[PDB]
Every structure is written in structure tokens, then in C-alpha cells.
Amino acid sequence: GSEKVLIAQERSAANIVQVFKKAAPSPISHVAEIRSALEKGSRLISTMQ
């Protein structure tokens, strides 16, 4: 008997390469991360850096 509304959740897109700069107190200077999702069902599977 209570009216409930679903709020849209904002997420980052999958299957795109994103390159970022790690900060100074770290041996890593740059990282290239991609998150992979199958087209059928649109569900996250694995992350590779």
C-alpha cells in the first residue's frame, strides 16, 4: 500500500579504455584500466589493468 519509486543509478560505462595518472607517492605513474561486460544482460564480468 506504499508508493515506491526507483531512482536511476549513475555508473561508469563498460568496455572503454580509461588511462589515469597515479599520484606521486607510488611507483606506478600511469594506469590503463578497462571493465568488461557481456552485451547479453549487461553485467560486469572482469576488470583488467
Partner 1 sequence: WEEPRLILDQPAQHDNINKRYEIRFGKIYLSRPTMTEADGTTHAMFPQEARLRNLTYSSPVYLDMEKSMFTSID
Partner 2 sequence: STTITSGLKYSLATGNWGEQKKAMSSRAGVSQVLNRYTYSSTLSHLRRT
Least distance to partner 1, CB of residue 46, Å: 17
**Per-position x/- string for 15-44, each x denoting binding to partner 1 as judged by CB under 8 A, each - no binding:** -------------------------xx---
Q: Dig out the grid coordinates for 41 from the structure.
A: 544482460
Matching residue, cell 544482460: 41
Count Cβ atoms within 10 A of the Cβ of residue 37 and give its class: 0-12 exposed, 13-18 middle, 19 or more buried.
middle
Question: What single-letter amino acid sits at 45?
Answer: I
Tell me which of partner 1, partner 2, none is bound by residue 1, counting a contact when its beta carbon lies within the kind-specific cut-off of 5 to 8 angstroms: partner 1
Instruction: Specify the stretch interacting with partner 1 by CB under 8 A; choose among 1-9, 18-26, 27-35.
Output: 1-9
